[PDB]
């Protein structure tokens, strides 16, 4: 069962390069605004304890070089929204898709278009970890690359890459500049918290396995939400809520396996392992498919 | 992370092809639409299709080609091996720079999975040693294509034709020649035992050393023959002297001789991971080529 990224064409046509002094990163060009991480205005000296309000008052439009391929876009205004810099430009992007800015929850999934200095390089599907980091690609200049979902012809942008954390994972904001997780855009000591497995996604993936004919892990038992959660916490799994059970309802109806029955199967898999078997061709449980993703893909 | 290529250049080439009651995907490049020739088959025809006989009975107007909301007029048709080539009225204004290439098992590429002309998702994969592809959920994804992009040029290497009984996919290059022993006929054909792409695992281990992970190395070496005798017991592909030569650059970069990395792999197969990960993976990854790894 292969994870897929969304087709990236609609976002490719929005990627540009933003340069401020010695610093270059990626920007997102939608109509006549370019969005990018505000730390593009920072020197290395400023990045130790930057005062962004003061640093931007000292900048003018001529400080910003924006290039869309082989075309310079002239900046005619600049402002900040939280941690995102907004550059008003000469020209509306003729390739702007229908789009929205949305904020996602930990455990939800999206595609990332990894870009280097305005040039799209690759696309991958990922989940926002419960500790609010993204286990991401190995790039050097991918700052400002964005994450998104597509529904019909509408691109929902949910993520912009700002920082690489010492453990090798990525941290960022939504497109309104609000950070995901307890991180700041500063060269200081910060580390990802202890991550956990996304339980509701593992359950969704077990439902996908049942829809695809792999049923060896099903058993006769049921558990309770309370006692499953005690097994979850003991195995570094997120707790399961009544809302999670409700989200899994369509898959329980389709397969005939109640959610607390599937929790019983997962509880046994966590205590006794796979005993040499695989679930979807995998000896490890996967937690980067949401219930929405599985409904979308399977039913 | 295994990344796919940005799919935009291929998205602009996907169309829907309908013949009778059968519909699948086509690839529109310049004034030609490429699609599986079994678009001219019903389900029953697939048991024993005679493609020459089925095709001689068609006119251009039997082929309905839709590019979004625009019908494309077919003005000629021709069969090349297992691919149908529909000449249309209009050259695709979105045609990228492109080439057709035939790949070898072990090579990687991205697939743009499409349903009835509409792009649905993109994934990165490898052509397995048994000439199949582990595919995606979409039922009617026939005609979806696989590709690499190098310097803004799309090299198309794969077109999906057939779903095999175990759930994997089989197909052709863009000249219509199947990969492997498969045919565009519903027979009892099945994927053979798959094996692991050894040269790709070794390239990935080098990537891990280059990125700072060294825990799996040991003090041993191996002969090539002893490595292959062991690796085959784990259903790994044999490693050839070509493969050893290909890894030379990474060997030079890391100061780890190729057969020393082979000795490490032997131990990894014997021991498993013991709870650890190598890059971000709890599994030995075999879908990064040595070309992929250098950058």
Swiss-Prot record, chain A:
Peptidase C30 domain location: 1-299
Residues shown, of full length: 3266 to 3564 of 4405
Activity regulation (record text): Inhibited by pyridone-containing alpha-ketoamides compounds 13a and 13b. In turn, alpha-ketoamide 13b (tert-butyl (1-((S)-1-(((S)-4-(benzylamino)-3,4-dioxo-1-((S)-2-oxopyrrolidin-3-yl)butan-2-yl)amino)-3-cyclopropyl-1-oxopropan-2-yl)-2-oxo-1,2-dihydropyridin-3-yl)carbamate) inhibits SARS-CoV-2 replication in human lung cells. Inhibited ex vivo by michael acceptor inhibitor N3. Inhibited ex vivo by compound 11a and 11b.
Function: Cleaves the C-terminus of replicase polyprotein at 11 sites. Recognizes substrates containing the core sequence [ILMVF]-Q-|-[SGACN]. Cleaves and inactivates human TRMT1, preventing tRNA guanine(26)-dimethylation of tRNAs. May cleave human NLRP1 in lung epithelial cells, thereby activating the NLRP1 inflammasome pathway. May cleave human GSDMD, triggering alternative GSDME-mediated epithelial cell death upon activation of the NLRP1 inflammasome, which may enhance the release interleukins 1B, 6, 16 and 18. Also able to bind an ADP-ribose-1''-phosphate (ADRP).
Span of the signal peptide: none
Residue(s) of cross-link: Glycyl lysine isopeptide (Lys-Gly) (interchain with G-Cter in ubiquitin): 3, 88
Protein name per UniProt: 3C-like proteinase nsp5
Active site location: 39, 143
Highest taxon above the source species: Viruses
Cytoplasmic side: 1-299
Result when mutating residue 203 to V: In strain: Zeta/P.2
Subunit and partners: 3CL-PRO exists as monomer and homodimer. Only the homodimer shows catalytic activity. Interacts with host FBXO22; this interaction promotes the proteasomal degradation of nsp5.
Effect of residue 47 to A: Does not affect ability to cleave and inactivate human TRMT1
Organism (species): Severe acute respiratory syndrome coronavirus 2
Reactions this protein catalyses: TSAVLQ-|-SGFRK-NH2 and SGVTFQ-|-GKFKK the two peptides corresponding to the two self-cleavage sites of the SARS 3C-like proteinase are the two most reactive peptide substrates. The enzyme exhibits a strong preference for substrates containing Gln at P1 position and Leu at P2 position
Cellular location(s): Host cytoplasm; Host Golgi apparatus; Host nucleus
């Amino acid at each position: 069962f292969r994870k897929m990224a969304f087709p990236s064409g609609k976002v490719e046509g929005c990627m540009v390069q933003v340069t401020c002094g010695t610093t270059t990163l990626n920007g997102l060009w939608l109509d006549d605004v370019v969005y990018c991480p505000r730390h593009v205005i920072c020197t290395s000296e400023d990045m130790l304890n930057p005062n962004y309000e003061d640093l931007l008052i000292r900048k003018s439009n001529h400080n910003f070089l924006v290039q869309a391929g082989n075309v310079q876009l002239r900046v005619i205004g600049h402002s900040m929204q939280n941690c995102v810099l907004k550059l008003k430009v000469d020209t509306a992007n003729p390739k702007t898709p229908k789009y929205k800015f949305v904020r996602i929850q930990p455990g939800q999934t999206f595609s990332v278009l990894a870009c280097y200095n305005g040039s799209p390089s690759g696309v991958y599907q990922c989940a926002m970890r419960p500790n609010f980091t993204i286990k991401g690609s190995l790039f050097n200049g991918s700052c400002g690359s964005v994450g998104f979902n597509i529904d019909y012809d509408c691109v929902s942008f949910c993520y912009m890459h700002h920082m690489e954390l010492p453990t090798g994972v990525h941290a960022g904001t939504d497109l309104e500049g609000n950070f995901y997780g307890p991180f700041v855009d500063r060269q200081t000591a910060q580390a990802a918290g202890t991550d956990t497995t996304i339980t509701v996604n593992v359950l969704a993936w077990l439902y996908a396995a049942v829809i695809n004919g792999d049923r060896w892990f099903l058993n006769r038992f049921t558990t309770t939400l309370n006692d499953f959660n005690l097994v979850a916490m003991k195995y570094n799994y997120e707790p399961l809520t009544q809302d999670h059970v409700d989200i899994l309802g369509p898959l329980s109806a389709q397969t005939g396996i109640a959610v607390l029955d599937m929790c019983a199967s997962l509880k046994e898999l966590l205590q006794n392992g796979m005993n040499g078997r695989t679930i979807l061709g995998s000896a490890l449980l996967e937690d980067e498919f949401t219930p929405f993703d599985v409904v979308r893909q399977c039913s």
